[PDB]
Amino acid sequence: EKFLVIAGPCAIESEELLLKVGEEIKRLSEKFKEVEFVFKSSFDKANRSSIHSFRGHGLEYGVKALRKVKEEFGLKITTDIHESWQAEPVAEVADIIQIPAFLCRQTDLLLAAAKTGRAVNVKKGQFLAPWDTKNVVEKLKFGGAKEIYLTERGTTFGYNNLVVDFRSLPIMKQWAKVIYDATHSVQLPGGLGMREFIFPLIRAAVAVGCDGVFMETHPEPEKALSDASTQLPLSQLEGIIEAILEIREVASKYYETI
Amino acid sequence: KFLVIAGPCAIESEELLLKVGEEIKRLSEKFKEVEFVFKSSFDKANRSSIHSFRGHGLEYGVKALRKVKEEFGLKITTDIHESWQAEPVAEVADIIQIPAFLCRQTDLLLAAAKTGRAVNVKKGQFLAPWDTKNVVEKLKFGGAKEIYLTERGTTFGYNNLVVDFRSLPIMKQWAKVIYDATHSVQLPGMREFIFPLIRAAVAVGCDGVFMETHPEPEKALSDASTQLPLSQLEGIIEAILEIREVASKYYETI
Amino acid sequence: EKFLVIAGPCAIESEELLLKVGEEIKRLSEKFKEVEFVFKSSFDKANRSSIHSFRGHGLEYGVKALRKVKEEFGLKITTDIHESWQAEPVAEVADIIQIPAFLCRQTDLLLAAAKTGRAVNVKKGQFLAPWDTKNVVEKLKFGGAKEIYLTERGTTFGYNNLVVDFRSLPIMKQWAKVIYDATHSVQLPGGLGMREFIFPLIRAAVAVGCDGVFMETHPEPEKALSDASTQLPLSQLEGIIEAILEIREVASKYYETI
Amino acid sequence: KFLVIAGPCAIESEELLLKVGEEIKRLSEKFKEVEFVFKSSFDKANRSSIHSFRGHGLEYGVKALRKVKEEFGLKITTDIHESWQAEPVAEVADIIQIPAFLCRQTDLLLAAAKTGRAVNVKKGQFLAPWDTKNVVEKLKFGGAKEIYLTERGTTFGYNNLVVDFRSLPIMKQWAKVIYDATHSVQLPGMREFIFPLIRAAVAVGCDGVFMETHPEPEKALSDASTQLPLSQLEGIIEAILEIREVASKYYETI
Ligand SMILES: O=P(O)(O)OC[C@@H](O)[C@@H](O)[C@H](O)CO
Ligand SMILES: O=P(O)(O)OC[C@@H](O)[C@@H](O)[C@H](O)CO
């Protein structure tokens, strides 16, 4: 099956930033034809720790910006919603509606996404056990979703630290397609993220076996308005993708059947 | 004075609320050294299963809660799940409760603070004690003045929560601290640990306790494995007041 | 039942240090007649993180030092063993033989302690669940122990941090007398301990209900050769003990029956 | 070259060791790019229950291990539990293994290093990756030169272990890192996760893998729920070599 790579800048800092990243993603999509790319960026960071941190430029602006990417590059789009009313307007441009990790159990949000007819990707709550995502998929299927994704993004391990229990990939694979979040799984919740572990954990994810990877990328991570410690420099994206396809290929014959 | 927030988990019917309201009203008359707050949810917006009881809706709920406040003169508190609910709920709720999973949702916190009512934030199972300083800052920025932080356990492996009582003194630096005696022992819950841990909460030091109670916990449509039997409420309250009276002499300053 | 207070300097820095602490413990034992005191100190810190840290002056020296305390003050004695051969010689002076937390599952060490006829106190491993101590008691009873204690000293919570799950006290009470370690439960494993939490957690322990408390105390913690961040200043011991007896008394009528 | 440490959990009989030794000897001939080490414990000194199988003693064990090294010319490794055992065990064991619970016992580490043999320390379930730097220092101080640190999971709530693969690159700064594929999935263990995680171990990067194997894992007197079936060993080895060959191009330096 075609491997999914969901990538893009964490936040929609500007339509310019999006075009620059989309251009590179478009180029890579032409090179890695066996990969299905999906451009990602949030119109709002509705859960920042601090009230003084960057949130965004509003839903209206973001959807317009994302639509420009899809139009100019012909790329699939995904972004996250935070309250039920946002699903409808977002569904106009988003091919995949993303459900934030903290909100993975909010019934109305999941139902709002499911009825749009779009694909839904739920980030696994840092508080949720692998086997507890079964009910999450049941809610989505009940709400009309026909294409569902579950994203591994780490689990609460003591304070201000997350650990990735890779046993979760085959467990979740039982009821949904699984995506590995390479950049948020190494972040330190309220710490201020460890970038040196992004690549190795990604290798692990593909050797274990998943249906795709989620990576936040920015031309200059050091200048990002969000996740400046975890976003991957855009120049490194090509090499990372090439590496996971290679590892995925050689490990593929050993993937267990669910 | 010491705060005691109690009531049934979900508004199963205004009937149920009135019955519990009666008992809470009685205790209220018996323990003048305690500020009682009637609590109940108009919607269980985060059940694990789509096939579980959620409730009768916001209007039926705000209605029944109005009936309790008017028939017993008790303060009220219930939780909101989306920004638009803050305003209508603030009509009856003296304290607006923010769900644990939603403690980082900026707009929800701001919407709550905007109503001018008191705000109680359940500490997320993913949050470290010191991470709550930022939750309070948001509320203050939003105009909130009476702010509460509730301890309800922290993620400890899978399907288990642990109470790190170091959290009470830490959170107290920036807000009044409430201990959730019923949800802190639930397994994402042995009722046998409810009383022992509430005793610890008061020996350590907190500004109030949160307890879900029901005439017949087993028949409850929600948290049936942890809701405290109504008849046991008085006994526990008297016990925590006695322990608090003695232990308060040693509560550390700030 | 008579409340147990196990206290003393972490390590046997010198026989002088022991006499100074024992003198104060002896004085307190005369004041708090409803308490059963047991003087504690280790002749060896066999599990320090660093090879350059203080271990002790040997078994021979320590046993002699402890015997001096028991002789000069008439106090019960307890110290920990690290290998089977030490039980016999230690049993000569120790009323209670202590089993280190990391060694709570070493069968021969437990059996070695049990056959001396002395009381045995096992520090609960930071890796052990409350209900798993049942087998630990079974091993001791099998080995001849007739007076067994289980000590709560925290559980691994992420890296370099321990949390105390107070549900463990009533659980362990089902098969042994339970002791709460007030000073090691707030230490940060390999961190360099948070002294400001010692007192509040002790209040919690007695309000929940336990059969005794374990506290390391030193005249000048800042100068200790071990646990300088967790040892309680000897001047504060009297007040702490008075406080727990008061809290224990008022909470006592509510202790659940096992 | 890549290290593969394998054998039955406990020395149930020199008979069992010889059978497994035969298969390991065969793989040894088939995979020259791999250094195989035969492993088995003469004593299970830390069983939870007093009524569980421990073994046949140190002499019967060191004897049977001698038979394997002499009949197949394989390197040997077994674990010690008290200082006095280092010397007699060093007679046959090429690598002395230090139990996870005992990774902080200074005298045991020193006793092992004193023999002059290689030393493999199982990382305690209570230890953080960076805390192993001190474990190595002790060994070096004791005269050890060939030092190994084995990843075997970390305490995650109760009765569960999680593998934080960030530990492999961290521990590599001061020692050769081995991944314990069988004990890392055991619940203080679904065999279904053994292969997937070993694949991750090699994709991430390690110097060898540790695997307990038995002709009939179910009949094993120890770790019966996690011991890998002897027949599946070859397949897994070939798989990790292939993955390693491809992934090694991306292993980070130091
Ligand atoms: O405000 P801070 O704590 O930096 O958090 C931001 C990240 O957690 C955020 O971008 C993420 O995708 C949402 O949780
Ligand atoms: O060597 P460090 O890490 O300071 O450790 C010492 C304490 O953990 C020690 O005194 C304790 O009683 C034994 O584990």
Instruction: From chain B, pick out residues whose CB is under 8 angstroms from the CB of D160.
Output: 157-158
Q: What is the DSSP string of chain B?
A: -EEEEEE-SB-S-HHHHHHHHHHHHHHHHH-TTEEEEEE-BS--TT-SSTTS---S-HHHHHHHHHHHHHHH--EEEEE-SSGGGHHHHHTT-SEEEE-GGGTT-HHHHHHHHHTTSEEEEEPPTT--GGGHHHHHHHHHHTT--SEEEEE--EE-SSS-EE--TTHHHHHTTTSEEEEETTGGG-----GGGHHHHHHHHHHH--SEEEEEEESSGGG-SSSTTTPEEGGGHHHHHHHHHHHHHHHGGGPPP-
Q: Is A50 close to B134, i.e. CB distance below 8 A?
A: yes
Distance CA D204, CA B158 (A): 25
Of A186, A243, A254, the CB nearest to D250: A243
Cα–Cα distance list, A155 to A163, A210, C132, D42 (Å): 5, 17, 25, 38
Domain C1-258: top CATH class: alpha beta
DSSP conformation class of D232? G
Distance CA D191, CA A243 (A): 28
Tokens 């205004």 sit at which residue? B14
Distance CA D22, CA D230 (A): 11
Distance CA C175, CA C168 (A): 12
Contact with chain A for residue D252, Cβ under 8 A: yes
Contact with chain D for residue A166, Cβ under 8 A: yes
| Ranges of each domain in chain D | 1-254
Query: CA-based angle C152:C105:D13, to the nearest 5?
Result: 165
Question: Which of C47, C55, C46 shows the shortest CA–CA distance to C12?
Answer: C55
Residue C27: count other Cβ atoms within 10 Å of its Cβ: 12
Backbone angles phi, psi at B32, to 5 degrees: -65, -15
Nearest CA to ligand 2 atom 13: C47
Token digits of residue C191: 């961190």
Instruction: From chain B, pick out residues whose CB is under 8 angstroms from the CB of C205.
Output: 200
Cβ-count burial B30-69 (b if 16+ within 10 Å, e if not): ebeebebbbbbbbbbbbbbebeeebbbebeebbebbebbb
Q: How many residues belong to chain B?
A: 254
Contact with chain B for residue D156, Cβ under 8 A: yes
Cα–Cα distance list, C146 to C97, C118, C140, C142, C200 (Å): 13, 8, 8, 10, 33
Residues 6 or more apart whose CB falls under 8 angstroms from that of B250 comprise C199, C203, C243
Distance CA B252, CA B238 (A): 23
Burial of residue D19, with CB atoms counted within 10 A of its CB: 0-12 exposed, 13-18 middle, 19 or more buried: middle
Token digits of residue B188: 């994402």
Ligand 1 midpoint to CA A48 (Å): 5
Residues 6 or more apart whose CB falls under 8 angstroms from that of A41 comprise A8, A9, A10, A11, A12, A18, A21, A62, A65, A66, A79
Gap from C85 CA to chain D (nearest CA, Å): 10
Q: Is A199 close to D169, i.e. CB distance below 8 A?
A: no
Map chain A to HEC letters: CCEEEEEECCECCCHHHHHHHHHHHHHHHHHCCCEEEEEECECCCCCCCCCCCCCCCCHHHHHHHHHHHHHHHCCEEEEECCCHHHHHHHHCCCCEEEECHHHCCCHHHHHHHHCCCCEEEEECCCCCCHHHHHHHHHHHHHCCCCCEEEEECCEECCCCCEECCCCHHHHHCCCCEEEEECCHHHCCCCCCCCHHHHHHHHHHHHHHCCCEEEEEEECCHHHCCCCCCCCEEHHHHHHHHHHHHHHHHHHHCCCCCC
Q: Do residues B237 and B36 make contact, with C-beta atoms less than 8 angstroms apart?
A: no
Residues 6 or more apart whose CB falls under 8 angstroms from that of D232 comprise none
Q: Say if ligand 2 is within 6 A of residue C76 CB.
A: no
Question: Which of D17, D117, D120 shows the shortest CA–CA distance to D72?
Answer: D17
Which chains form contacts with chain C, at 3 or more CB pairs under 8 Å?
A, B, D
Contact with chain C for residue A157, Cβ under 8 A: yes
Ligand 2 midpoint to CA C226 (Å): 7
Among A45, A50, A123, A230, which residue has the most ligand 1 atoms within 8 Å of its CB, making it the best to mutate?
Answer: A45
Instruction: From chain D, pick out residues whose CB is under 8 angstroms from the CB of C103.
Output: 101-102, 105
How far is Cα of residue A126 from the mean position of the Cα atoms in its chain?
A: 15
Residues 6 or more apart whose CB falls under 8 angstroms from that of B229 comprise B213, B214, B215, B216, B217
Gap from D177 CA to chain A (nearest CA, Å): 15
Instruction: From chain C, pick out residues whose CB is under 8 angstroms from the CB of A158.
Output: 157-159, 161
Residues 6 or more apart whose CB falls under 8 angstroms from that of B10 comprise B40, B41, B44, B53, B55, B220, B221, B222
Gap from D160 CA to chain B (nearest CA, Å): 8
Secondary structure tally for chain C: helices H, strands E: 8, 11
Find, in chain D, the residue whose alpha carbon is nearest to that of C138: D50
Nearest CA to ligand 1 atom 5: A48
Distance CA A136, CA A107 (A): 9
- Tell me the pairing of strands B154-155 and B161-162: antiparallel
- Alpha helices by DSSP H, listed for C94-215, are 107-114, 133-142, 168-172, 198-208
How far is Cα of residue D107 from the mean position of the Cα atoms in its chain?
A: 21
Tokens 């579980």 sit at which residue? B52
Distance CA A95, CA C28 (A): 73
Measured in angstroms, the resolution is 1.9
Long-range contacts of A88-92 (CB under 8 A, 24+ apart): A88/A112, A88/A116, A89/A59, A89/A63, A90/A59, A90/A63, A90/A116, A91/A116, A91/A117, A91/A118, A92/A63, A92/A67
Residue C196: count other Cβ atoms within 10 Å of its Cβ: 12
How far is Cα of residue C113 from the mean position of the Cα atoms in its chain?
A: 16
In CATH terms, the fold of domain D1-254 is TIM Barrel (3.20.20)
Token digits of residue D121: 């320390």
β partners of residue D36:
D4
Of A166, A196, A251, the CB nearest to D197: A166
Distance CA A86, CA A98 (A): 11
Dihedral over alpha carbons C231, C234, C240, C242 (to 10 degrees): 150
- Tell me the pairing of strands C232-233 and C76-80: unpaired
Residue D180: count other Cβ atoms within 10 Å of its Cβ: 25
Tokens 């960026």 sit at which residue? A41
Residue D70: count other Cβ atoms within 10 Å of its Cβ: 10
Contact with chain A for residue C161, Cβ under 8 A: yes
Residues 6 or more apart whose CB falls under 8 angstroms from that of C224 comprise C9, C10, C11, C13, C218, C231
Ligand 1 midpoint to CA C85 (Å): 55
Tokens 């040894």 sit at which residue? D28
Find, in chain C, the residue whose alpha carbon is nearest to that of D84: C83
Tokens 């199963």 sit at which residue? B12
Which chains form contacts with chain A, at 3 or more CB pairs under 8 Å?
B, C, D
Helix, strand, coil % in chain C, rounded to nearest 5? 40, 20, 40
Q: Is C199 close to B242, i.e. CB distance below 8 A?
A: no
Token digits of residue D103: 């990774």
Token digits of residue D17: 């060791």
Q: Do residues D97 and D39 make contact, with C-beta atoms less than 8 angstroms apart?
A: yes
Distance CA B47, CA A21 (A): 39
